[PDB]
From a paper:
Here, we report the first structure of glycerol kinase from the thermophilic filamentous fungus Chaetomium thermophilum (CtGK). Glycerol kinase (EC 2.7.1.30) catalyzes the transfer of phosphate moiety from ATP to glycerol to form glycerol 3-phosphate (G3P). Overall, the CtGK polypeptide chain can be divided into two distinct domains classified by Pfam as FGGY_N (residues 65–325) and FGGY_C (residues 331–583) connected by a flexible region. A similar case is found in CtGK, which forms extended dimers via the interaction between the C-terminal domains with a prominent contribution from hydrophobic residues (Phe422, Gly436, Phe389, Leu394, Thr437, Phe439, Gly440, Ile441, Thr437, Thr445, Leu438, Ile450, Trp580).
Numbering used by the authors:
A (entry chain D): 65 to 540, 551 to 583
B (entry chain A): 65 to 540, 550 to 583
The structure:
């Protein structure tokens, strides 16, 4: 086959895309599924809601694939990319879930996180797995379920509990789950580096990480850790429109976006804009443990005599959310297109600085007692100035994270690719280039995340032979270049840093 | 004669009102006049623009007075109240102005005040006149004119330069000016305490004050300082619809407001809401020199048989301006009415605090390197919350100033009366009561400033015999807002305000 498919299983969305050898999607289908919020801070999904949405997107895309004269014979393989950390538990014997998936934003584990941080050896986990303790990793979600949901506890104690991130669950069921010969219970190194069970350097489950959380290896069934690109580890789709088509790629969704942007060299970074931001920074074959609260994770692992590549990761809470705040909360304008117009309406920020720390500031500032704080207001401040400061806020924090990634890794920032929500704003992307002093590359093929999984599967099956082949095949309103004098750029950043400094201490108990 | 007229000459508008014995206006007329802004920071008025606007208001109001069947035969006297500091210079022989009036917000004296602040003896001015050096007092404006307007240079050196605040210019001209027999060149104690020429304790021109600025008393003609209520010192209207009616009252406008609210006892205070705020605090018969940058001024001086009364004054730059900012700059709503509505749409400030320091903060903070700074924003913050915070900002600053006046004077806060612009917001004033822990009196008759000058003229001429007669006559939407909030919540919200203020200083760099 000449085409490659890509399952993109998201937090709010599932979709299937079929790419050609030049990385362009020829057929696609997207479905918004149900998310469940039982309590405040609780976030759950029916595991079958994830699967069935994927399956319908597969069917939907292949009907339009048929309308252009192709069949599953034309697809050489498919890759999977998925929301990370989201924790799924099922019965190893039946393959049926024992509880709804706990989605990555779920906060029901705070108390447990507090307890675990006080435990002995909690100091050592960052160095082992790349991540600190928080509500996010799958380790604490799974531990919570074992201690609070009893169908899970007894499954565990009886040796029939299976754990999986959403990739593992989808691969397991798409291969036929329990009912099938050679059942596939696997996860790729990227997804696996998000749990806190995997030694980041060896890419193997570590007994000291598993021991810290109290999960017994020979009682629970963990997914075998395999490369993100492999022609046989992931099995094949058992039934349906893709019956018999191999799965050959598997990547956590943020890693997939880095791959889709061809960020294959150290110093190459990406930012995905949504309600917030996820930033990843290729740091090469050698892992880096951050000194500024960045996450150390696997960028991609392509097996074939390939040394796995690592990344540093940072996040921003308020990006697109800031635009939503200007539209709905303040009534500046009803659509984001017009917020950008307001920002372009004025020459500069009018001295305005908006520290958008709605829920505090994360890496590298780590300021939890700040709230949204707007500086520089006068009688002559207008909506346009505030709109600019809102866009500038994300670029300032983006630079702050990229700068921290530079000092941690010692690899000079070489490029920044962007995709999703705010990346469409020409003004803010230009501002990012100006502030950071680096070109901002924005592809007009907008399905970068899905493209990453296609590349992984395509490499496993020879659609592309090397990453150099990938970049030039994919290569064949796209790049913003620094145009601001660097003195003005440093001035603007220093008053950002200052606004931040004055924002700390606002929330007193 | 049983009615009393009032000339209210303001910064943008003049007005003439006729009050009855109970303090209600029976006829009124207002005219917006022309203000000139030649340079950035320069504010001028044609002195005849203010005189004729007054004359037109008099004509307009008297026609309405005639519609009710009355004439000047029914008006016992009139009083004047005026924008303060606004400086007028005219020629002593001809009575015509030698330059445009420099109005109080004018900033052309920045340089001159910078040098004067560096002159030795400058440290002594506040203790003598109650004011510090700044762009506002008449002293720096007059000195500037003599040093930069050669027509006034020559008039001074020729001994034919006359100086006057707006009150003295109007009284002078309404009496006949140069041509009249018994020409009147006077100013009341309040307007005179805004000059920096007057010793505040003696209410006499002081040679040390005049000497500091280089003004020679035997070469310029200074207006004779007279009481704010006097049956003869102000003369009479020479011409027109009120020909022959005596002038018997004269008060600086913010002093007039305090009088109109009947703030005659120590601890009684008033706030006048406009684009900003003007607060005066009655401190009794002996002046108080502030330790918090407040101004020591004459509250009112009702002449023979009465000891002059003094006051502490503070100001807030942004009050109604904050509501304008929400409507025009942010598009929250097109009318002030509906900004209140949004603020009432929410239960509280949502954790929001708006340090409305667009031009820094004045008394008691004195922070020049802050700007407008909004705190406590989240995804759940709404226009209503920010509206509340904007109203609350004026209440927090109002309390801050009243707190300073208490510590300066040692007189417990007894009363707070309110008038003008933002005082119409039921929510803003209820909040003021909550934050300050005292009832807030809001009169239904909303021409409080003009009534102050009527009271002075009425007292001078026996329309009212004593100040308790005044209080009794006058006190005879809502009127009074009482504290509803628990004291602890009020202190918590103030300390949050103080915190926000403290975190906004240092924004501007130099």
């Amino acid at each position: 086959g000449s085409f490659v498919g890509s399952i993109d299983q998201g937090t709010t969305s599932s979709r299937f895309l079929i790419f050609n050898g030049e990385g362009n999607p020829v057929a696609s289908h997207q479905i918004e599924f149900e998310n469940l919020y039982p309590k405040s801070g609780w976030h759950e999904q029916d595991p079958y809601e994830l699967l069935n949405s994927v399956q319908q997107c597969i069917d939907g895309a292949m009907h339009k694939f048929a309308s252009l004269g192709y069949s599953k014979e034309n697809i050489r393989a498919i890759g999977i990319t998925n929301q990370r950390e989201t924790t799924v538990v099922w019965d190893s014997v039946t393959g049926e879930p024992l509880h709804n998936a706990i989605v990555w934003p779920d906060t029901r584990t705070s108390a447990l996180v507090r307890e675990l941080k006080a435990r002995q050896s909690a100091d050592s986990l960052l160095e082992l797995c790349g991540l600190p303790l928080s509500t996010y990793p799958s380790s604490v979600k799974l531990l919570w379920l074992i201690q609070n949901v009893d169908a899970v506890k007894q499954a565990y104690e009886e040796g029939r509990l299976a754990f999986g991130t959403v990739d593992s669950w989808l691969i397991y069921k798409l291969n036929g789950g329990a009912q099938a010969e050679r059942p596939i219970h696997v996860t790729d190194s990227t997804n696996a580096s998000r749990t806190m069970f995997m030694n980041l350097r060896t890419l193997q489950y570590d007994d000291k990480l598993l021991g810290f959380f109290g999960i017994d290896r020979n009682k629970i069934k963990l997914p075998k850790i395999v490369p993100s690109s492999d022609p046989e580890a992931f099995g094949k789709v058992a039934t349906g429109a893709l019956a018999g088509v191999p799965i050959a790629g598997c990547l956590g969704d943020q890693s997939s976006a880095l791959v889709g942007q061809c960020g294959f060299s150290p110093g190459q970074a990406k930012n995905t804009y949504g309600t917030g931001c996820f930033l990843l920074y290729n740091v090469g074959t050698e892992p880096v443990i951050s000194k500024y609260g960045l996450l150390a994770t696997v960028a991609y692992d392509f097996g074939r005599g390939r040394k796995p590549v690592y990344a540093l990761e940072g996040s921003i809470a308020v990006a697109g959310a800031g635009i939503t705040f200007l539209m709905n909360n303040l009534g500046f304008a009803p659509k984001p297109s017009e917020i950008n117009a307001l920002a372009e309406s004025v020459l500069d920020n009018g001295g305005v600085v908006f520290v958008t720390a709605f829920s505090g500031l994360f890496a590298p500032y780590w300021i939890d007692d700040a709230k949204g704080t707007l500086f520089g207001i006068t009688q002559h401040t207008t909506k346009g100035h505030i709109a600019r400061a809102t866009l500038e806020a994300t670029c300032y924090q983006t630079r702050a994270i990229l700068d921290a990634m530079e000092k941690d890794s010692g690899h000079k920032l070489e490029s920044l690719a962007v995709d999703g929500g705010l990346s469409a704003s020409d003004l803010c992307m230009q501002t990012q280039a100006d502030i950071s002093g680096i070109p901002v590359d924005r592809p007009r093929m907008r399905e970068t995340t899905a493209l990453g999984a296609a590349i992984a599967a395509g490499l496993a099956t020879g659609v592309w032979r090397e990453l150099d082949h990938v970049k030039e095949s994919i290569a064949g309103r796209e790049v913003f270049y620094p145009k601001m004098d660097r003195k003005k750029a440093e001035r603007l950043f220093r008053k950002w840093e200052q606004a931040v400094e004055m924002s700390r201490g606002w929330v007193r108990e």
